[PDB]
């Protein structure tokens, strides 16, 4: 039953993802708890964000054909397209990444099997842009 509602909310999440971006066809993977950090170069250390929640990797019916979002447990989400300017570095249970703006990030995973699996998935769908 806990998983019935689980399946349910993954159905509703897809749909919510779609109302904000309709090129979206399906969720490729999701995780339990993840939390977002950003790197501050000036101060030279990591800094917490207000972002913490569930991570969804989804496919799109148009380039960029992949994206990922952290739906926050306030209402400010992380949204990130999977293009070739995205680069990753895995340091379990953290997943570091840089994007087009050159801003630096770390996704901490609670479950380190999620960390490995998503890291692998990303690497696959970065090789495909």
């Amino acid at each position: 039953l806990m998983e019935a509602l689980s399946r349910a909310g993954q159905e509703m999440s897809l749909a919510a993802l779609k109302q904000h971006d309709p090129y979206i066809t399906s969720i490729a993977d999701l995780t339990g708890q993840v939390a977002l950090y950003t790197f501050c170069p000036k101060a030279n250390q990591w800094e917490k964000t207000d972002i913490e929640g569930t991570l969804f990797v989804y496919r799109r019916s148009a380039s960029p054909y992949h994206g990922f979002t952290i739906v926050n447990r306030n209402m400010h989400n992380l949204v990130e397209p999977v293009n070739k300017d995205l680069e990753f570095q895995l340091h379990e249970p953290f997943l570091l990444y840089r994007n087009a703006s050159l801003s630096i990030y770390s996704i901490w995973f609670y479950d380190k099997n999620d960390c490995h699996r998503i890291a692998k998935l990303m690497a696959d769908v970065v090789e495909e842009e």
């Binding site: 800094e47 340091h91 953290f94 630096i104």
Partner: peptide, 14 residues
Amino acid sequence: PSPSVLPKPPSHWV
């Protein structure tokens, strides 16, 4: 959720 004491990013990213 770890204190902001994660590992450093690849040197070349900075």
